[PDB]
Structure formats: C-alpha cells, structure tokens
Subunit: 58 residues, 10 copies
C-alpha cells in the first residue's frame, strides 16, 4: 500500500552495527539479510527469501 | 495499508547494535534478518522468509 | 490498516542492542529477526517467517 | 485497524537491550524475534512466525 | 504500491557497519544480502533470493 | 576580593524587566543604573556614580 | 580582585528589557547606564559616572 | 584584577532590549550607555563618563 | 588587568536592540554609547567619555 | 592589560540593532558611538570621546 515518510530531522548522527575489541582472537560479523542505516531510513520486502546464517566453530 | 510517518526530530543520535570487549577470545555477531537503524526508521515485510540463525560451538 | 505516527521529539538519543565486557572468553549476539532502532521507529510484518535461533555450545 | 501515535517528547534517551560484565566466561544474547527501540516506537505483526530460541549448553 | 520520502535533514552523519580491533587474529565481516547506508536511504525488494551465510571455522 | 561562581544550571529561562499593557496612554521605563539579566549573572561596582532618575509629569 | 565564573548551562533562554503594548500613545524606554543581557553575563565598573535619567513630560 | 569566564552553554537564545507595540503614536528607546547582549557576555569600565539621558516631551 | 573568556557555546542565537511597531507615528532609537551584540561578547572601556543623549520633543 | 577570548561556538546567529515598522511616519536610528556585532565580538576603548546624540523634534 501507501507508505509516506516526513522526516525533518536536524543534527542527526547514526551508527549502525559496530564492534569494538582489544586482544580478541576473533571478530565475526554476519548478516544474512539486509542492513539499512541512515538518518532517515526505509526498508520493505527486504528479505523475501530465507535469511539464515551459521557461525559454527568446531 | 496506509503508513504515514511524521517525524520532526532535532538533535538525534542513534546507535544500533554494538559490542565492546577487552581480552575476549571471540566476538560473534549474527543477524539472519534485517537491521534498520536511523533517526527516523521504517521497516515492513522485512522477513518474509525463515529468519533462523545458529551460533553453535563444538 | 491505517498507521500514523506523529513524532515531534527533540534531543533524542537512542541505543539499541549493546554489550560491554572485560576478559570474557566469548561474546555472542544473535538476531534471527529484525532489529529496528531509531529516534522514531516503525516496524510491521517484520517476521513473517519462523524466527528461531540456536546458540548451542558443546 | 487504525493506529495513531502522537508523541511530543523532549529530552528523550533510550537504551534497549544491554549487558555489562566483568571477567565472565561467556556473554550470550539471543533474539528470535524483533527488537524495536526508539524514542517513539511502533511495532505490529512483528512475529507472525514461531519465535523460538535455544541457548543450550552441554 | 506508493512509496514517498520527504527528508529534510541537516548536519547528517552516518556510519553503517564498522569494526574496530586491536591484536585480533581475525576480522571477518559477511554480508549475504544488501547493505544500504546513507543520510536518506530507501531499500525494497533487496533480498528476493535466499540470504544465507556461513562463517564456519574448523 | 575573590568572587567565584559555580553555576551548573539546566533548562534555564530568564526574563528581566518587562511591561505588558493594553490601551494605555503611556508606557515609561527608566533605568538610571545597570541592568544585568541572564541565566548566570554577576555584577559588581555597577553604580559607582549617583543613580538618580526622575519621571516627572506636569 | 579575582572574579571567576563557571557556568555550565544548557537550554538557556534570556530576555532582558522588553515592553509590550496595544493602542498606547507612547512607549518610552530609557537607560542611562549599562544593560548586559546574556546566558552568562558579567559586568563590573559599568557606571563609574553619574547614571541619571529624566523622562519629564509637560 | 583578574577576570575569568568559563561558559559551556548549549542551546542558547538571547534577546536584549525589545519593544512591541500596536497603534502607538511614539516609540522611543534611549541608551546613554552601553548595551551588551550575547550568549556569553562580559563588560567592564563601560561607562567611565556621565551616563545621563533625557526624554523630555513638551 | 587580565581578562579571559572561555566560551564553548552551541546553537546560539542573539538579538540585541529591536523594536516592532504597527501604525506608529514615530520610531526613535538612540544610542549615545556602544552596543555590543554577539554570541560571545566582550566590551571594556567602551564609554570613556560622557554618554548623554536627548530625545526631546516640542 | 591582557585580554583573551576563546570562543568555540557553533550554529551562531546574531542580529544587532533592528527596527520593524508598518505605516509609521518616521523611523530614526541614531548611534553616536560604536556598534559591534558578531558571533564573537570584542570591543575596547571604543568611545574615548563624548558620545552624545540628540533626536530633537520641534
């Protein structure tokens, strides 16, 4: 249907997905899907498919 | 149907998904789905599919 | 149906999903679904599918 | 049906899902579903599917 | 259907997906899907297919 | 001597010398001296001289 | 001597010397001296001389 | 002597000397001295001389 | 002597000496002295001389 | 002596001496002295002489 956005934003800061580490053997980031970041952000029908992720360690 | 947003926001700061660590053997982040971050943020029908994630350690 | 949002927000700060650690063998974050973060935030029909996540350690 | 929001909020701060630790062998966070965080936040029909998560340790 | 965006944003800063590390044996970032970052950002029908990613270590 | 001020004030509003009228033949304001207005305000040795004012009507 | 000011003020508004009128034959404002207005305001030795003002009507 | 100012002010608004009128035969403003207006404002030795003003009507 | 100013101000607005009128036979503004306006403002030894002003109507 | 200014100001607006009118037979502005306007503003020894102004109407 109808989607509307009115965003009158000022002095916007945005951080999305971050990691900070020190003396760490691994850093893993996984996204099976969609990341949207922004001051003003819209997202629809992003994951029509199977969003499935594995981080398996043996 | 109809979706409307009126956002008059000022002095916005946003952080989404963060991690902080020190002397950690691992950092894992998993997203099987959709991340939206923002000052003003909309999301619909993001995960039409199976959002399933495994972080298995052996 | 009809969804409306009127947000007149000022001096907004937002943090979503964070972790802080020190001398930790692991940090795991899992999302099988959808994360929305923001000053003003809308989300609908995010998880149409099976949002199921496993963090199994052996 | 009809959903309306009128939010005139000022000096908003929001934290969602956080963890703090020191000298902890693990940190696990699991979300099988949807997280919405924000100053003003709406969410509907988020989990149409089975939101089921396991954190099993052996 | 109809998607509209009105974004009158000023003094926008955006960071998307970042990692910071020190003396870490690995940094892995995985995206099986679509990343959109921006001041103003729209995304639809991004992942029509199966967004599935594996980060398996043996 | 020594004058110190420590003012940690938040959400300050200040009005000084105001007048409001309706259908008044005159409005007179007189200051022979010094007006200081402010959130945080200091004043010393303002009127070293003769602060003398006349509003005489004949 | 020593004058110090520490002002950590936030969300400051200041009005000094104002007048409001409707259907008034005169508005007179007189300052023989010094006006200081501000969020943070200091004033010293302003009126070393004779601050004397007359608003005489005949 | 020593004058110091530490002003850490945010979201400052300042108005000094204003007048508002409607259907008024006169508006007079007089300053014989010094006006300082500002967010942060300092003033010293402004009026070393005779600050004397007359608004006489006959 | 020593004058110091530390002003860390953000989002500053300043108005000094204003007048507003409607259907007024006169507007007079007089300054015999010195006007300083600003976000951050300093003024010293402004009026070493005789600051004396007359607005006389006959 | 020593005058120092440290001004770290952001988003500064400044108006000094303004007048607004409608259907007014006169507008007079007089300055016998010195006007300084600015975001950051300093002024010293401005009026060493006699700052004296007359606005006389007959």
């Amino acid at each position: 249907g109808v989607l509307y956005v009115g965003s009158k934003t000022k002095e916007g800061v945005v951080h999305g997905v971050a990691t900070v580490a020190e003396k760490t053997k691994e850093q893993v980031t996984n996204v099976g899907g969609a990341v949207v970041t922004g001051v003003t952000a819209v997202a629809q029908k992003t994951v029509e498919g199977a969003g499935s992720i594995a981080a398996a360690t043996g």
